[PDB]
Symmetry: C2
Subunit: 451 residues, 2 copies
Amino acid sequence: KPYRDRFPSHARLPRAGLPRAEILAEIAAMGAAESPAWRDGYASGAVYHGDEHHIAFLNEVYALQSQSNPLHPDLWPSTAKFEAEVVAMTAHMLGGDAAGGTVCGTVTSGGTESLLLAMKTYRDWARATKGITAPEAVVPVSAHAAFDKAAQYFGIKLVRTPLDADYRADVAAMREAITPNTVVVAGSAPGYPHGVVDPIPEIAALAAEHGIGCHVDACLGGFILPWAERLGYPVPPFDFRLEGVTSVSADTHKYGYGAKGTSVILYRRPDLLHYQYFIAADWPGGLYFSPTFAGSRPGALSATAWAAMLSLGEEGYLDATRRILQAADRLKAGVRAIPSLKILGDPLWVIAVASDELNIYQVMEEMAGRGWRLNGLHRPPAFHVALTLRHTEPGVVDRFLADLQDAVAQVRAHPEKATGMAPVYGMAAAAPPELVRQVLTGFIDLLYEVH
Amino acid sequence: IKPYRDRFPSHARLPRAGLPRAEILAEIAAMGAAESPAWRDGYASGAVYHGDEHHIAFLNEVYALQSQSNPLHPDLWPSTAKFEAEVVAMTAHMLGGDAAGGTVCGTVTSGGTESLLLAMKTYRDWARATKGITAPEAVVPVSAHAAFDKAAQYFGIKLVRTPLDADYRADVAAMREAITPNTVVVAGSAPGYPHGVVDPIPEIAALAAEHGIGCHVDACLGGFILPWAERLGYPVPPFDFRLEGVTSVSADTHKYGYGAKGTSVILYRRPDLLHYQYFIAADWPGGLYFSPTFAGSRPGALSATAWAAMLSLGEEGYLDATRRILQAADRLKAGVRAIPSLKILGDPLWVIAVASDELNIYQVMEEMAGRGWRLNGLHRPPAFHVALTLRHTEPGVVDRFLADLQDAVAQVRAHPEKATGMAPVYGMAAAAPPELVRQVLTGFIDLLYEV
Ligand code: NA
C-alpha cells in the first residue's frame, strides 16, 4: 500500500463531488510511478506490447466504443461485427479451415473464462449425449490453475497427470487416467510454468480414440506459435489441423496485443458451441440469452482486440514474434552460459530457470533488488520470465543477463542469505496447502483493506 | 440485421499487411456517429445510464491513464488495488454496512451477473462446509434475474422460483413453503428488472435468518438509486445491511453508479462468507495462485472508472441524479396512467413496465419503435418496460415519450389486429414452447457471429 501516505483514502463517498481534474491528477501521478517497471522491460509478462503509439491507438478505440454493451446488438451492431471478426480471424489463424469451415466460437473476458467455458461445455455435452453425470477431466500437472477453478465450479473431477523429463505431459499417464466418466483431456501450447508445448498430436489422438473432447490451452501461444512455425522454429501442429482437437483457447489480450479483458474460445463444430450458450425462455423479463458468463460486457474491449489484430496483420504478428524469439534465443544462451543455473525443458520464449546448487528464490530476490519482477514457481522451485515486446527493446536482454550473473555470484558468495520475498516463496513451497489457503486468504483481505 | 455488410469490408482472415491505424479509427468513428444518437437522445431503455459527454470524456481519460492495469498483479498496479478496495468500502457504507458492525466486505466484479453467480457459488460452498448440504437449493421469486438460472445450472444448485402477489412483489408465504433442509439461500430484488418493484426484503431477510440460511439482495439495478430515493423522501423499505438477515448484496457501479461498463460490486455481511468466494491454488507448478473472483487477468482500467465516477459524483451527485430520474419517472408514470387502455404493473419508482388488457401491447411497443424508441419487451405477462436513466431527464425527452405513446395507442386502437415488425416475434415467443425458443435463439446467436 505505497499511497497510504501520499493520497487521501476513501472509505465513504465524499459529501460533495470531487473535481474531475483532481481525480485525474492522482491517477496520472500513480501512472508515472507505476509505468516505468513494465515500460522499461522489468516485468515478466504483464504487459505484452507496451508501445506508446500502439497504446494511444487502443485508448482511442476504447474512447470511440466506450458506451458499447454487446448485450444489446441492436444498439451496437459495430461491436457484434468486431466480435464475429475477431473469432473468424483467430479461427483461421488456428487451422480452422482444416476442420472444413465448421470452427466457431466466442469472444470472452480472458483465458480463464475461455477455459471455464470449455470445461462447462464438455460437461454439459457429455451429460446430454453420453449420459455422464459424474464428469472427469484429465490434464497434466502443468495445465493452468484455472482448470481446478473449472473443476470446483462445475463439479468436474480433475485428474492431474505427471510430466516427463522434458516437462511435457506424459501421455501414457494420461491414457491410464481415462475412465468411462472422462469428458475431456487437455494439453497446453505452451503451459505457463515452463513455456513448453505438450505433445498435442498424441493427446488429440488419445482423445479421439476414446470419443472424448480435446482442449488445447493456447491462451499463451495462440498468437505466437503459428508465426514461430512460419519463421522456421520447431513447432508441431497444436490446433484444429489435428483431427482430434475439439476446442482451442487463445488470448487476444496476451500476444494478440489487444487491451486487457478479451480472449477467444473456439470449438470444432457448432453442436459443441451450442452447449455454451445460456438461454432463458420463461423469465418475466422477456427473452434473455448470453453466449458467455457475463450479461452486460465492456464492448469497447472487443473493439480493441479487433483493432489490434487488423493493425498488425500477418506481417505484424510475424515481426513481433520474430523479435520475441530472437530475444528469447539470446536470453536462453546467456542463462545456459551462467554456472549453477539450468532451464526447465526446451521452451521457445517463456523461460523457467532453476538451480540444483543454489537457492533459486534468493537469485530471484537479487534480481528483484535490481528492479526485475519475475514469477516465482514451485514444484520445482524456479523463477520464470515470459518475454514480451518490452524485452525486445535495445539493451533489455543484456541487462537481464548481467543482473542474473551478478545475482548468481552474490548467492554463491552467501548461499544461506535469504531476504525479502525469498523466505516467503521458500515457506510457501514447504507449507501444507490448507495453511497456504489460510494465509493467502488473509493476503487477499489485506489488498481490500481501506485505512 | 447487419447494417455494415455493404458499407465496410468484412474480415474473415487476418490482413496480410497491417491496416493503417487511422483508417481503422475512421471506421469505428463512423459507426459511433451512426449508433450514438439512439442512446444520446434518450431513445433507449436502460443501456446507457449517464451518457453525458463531459462525464464520458472524463472516464475515457481515466481508462487511458490506467489502460495497462491488470489487478492480477497488485505489485505492478497498487493504484488499481486501492481503487477496488475503495469502491468496495464506499459502496458497503452506502448500503448500510456500518450497521453490520464494520464486518461488511466484498469485491469488485465484472458485472451484475458475475456478482450474482459469485454469491450463489459462495452460499453453495459455505453450506457444504458448514451445514453438510450436498444437494443445495435456492429459493427466489419468479421475477428474480435470469442470472439465477445461470448460477443454478453452472454450480449444480436446484433453483426454486416462487410466485408474485398482485402487486408483482415476491409472495413470502410461498417462499417459506419452498424452503427445505437443503435450501442454502433465499433472494429478493431491489428492484427486480422486469417491473421495477422492490421485493419485501425485511420479510425475506427475517425468513432467511429464522432458517439459518443466506439472504441475497439483488440491488444490481437499485443499489445506486434506492439509498438516495430514500433520502429524498420516496417510499423505499430497508433493503440492505440494516436488516440483520441480509448476508449479501450486489450493486452495479456500471449501472446507476455511472462507471464504465464492466464493473459491479458483491458485498457480504462478514469475512467468513466472503472467504468462500476466493479461489486459491497451492500445488500448481506455476506457483502460488489466487483469484478473488471468476477472472484471472482483468481490465483494471474499468475499476478505475468506477472509483473515479463515484468520487466525481459524491453523495450530492447521486442525490441530484436520482432526484432528476425520479421526477422524470413521476411525470412519465402519470402520463401513462392518463392513457385509457394502459396500466403499469405494480408500483415502481423508475423502471416502468406497461401493459394493456384491451390492446396488443406488443404492437403498441412496435409503434414506439417506429418512432425511434428502443424498449424492452416482456412476457409473463406481455408488456414492455422503460428503465429511465439520466438520458431521459434531458429537456423534452419524457414529453416525446408520452406524445409518441399516445399516438401509438391511438393507432393500435384504430387497428387492433395490426401486428408488424417485431410485434409478431414477441407474440410468438410468448406462446412458444421453451425448447423451441431455445433452438431459435441458438440460431440467432449463431447469426450474430456470422462473417
Ligand atoms: Na547454465
